[PDB]
Amino acid sequence: DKLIGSCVWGAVNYTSNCRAECKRRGYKGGHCGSFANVNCWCET
User: Fold this and answer.
1) Which keywords fit this entry according to its UniProt record?
2) Beta carbons of 31 and 37 less than 8 angstroms apart
3) Quick check: helix, strand or coil at residue 23?
4) Domains identified in the chain, total number
5) Alpha carbon distance 26, 33 (integer Å)
6) Which of 4, 17, 30, 36 has its CA 20 to 30 A from that of 44?
7) CB atoms within 10 A of CB 7
8) Angle CA(34)–CA(37)–CA(12) in degrees, nearest 5?
9) Please, are residues 15 and 27 in contact by the beta-carbon 8 Å criterion?
10) Phi and psi at residue 19, in whole multiples of 5°?
């Protein structure tokens, strides 16, 4: 899994869509999780 940012509103790396953004950047996909869906990890 590749961390590219955070799927939480407020962080200086908020992903518009965790799965979509990661897919665009040549990734299998992406899932939002960690502590209360804060970190966005791209499927890899």
Assistant:
1) Antimicrobial, Defensin, Disulfide bond, Fungicide, Immunity, Innate immunity, Secreted
2) no
3) helix
4) 1
5) 20
6) 36
7) 24
8) 95
9) no
10) -65, -45
Structural tokens at position 24: 């665009």
Instruction: List strand residue ranges (DSSP E) for 1-44, in order.
Output: 2-6, 29-33, 39-43
Provide the token pair at 43: 């499927």
Q: Which amino acid, residue 7?
A: C
Q: Technique behind this structure?
A: NMR
Asked if 31 and 20 touch (Cβ cutoff 8 Å), the reply is: no
Which two three-digit tokens encode residue 8? 């939480």
User: Position 34: which residue type?
Assistant: S
Q: Which domain holds residue 5?
A: 1-44
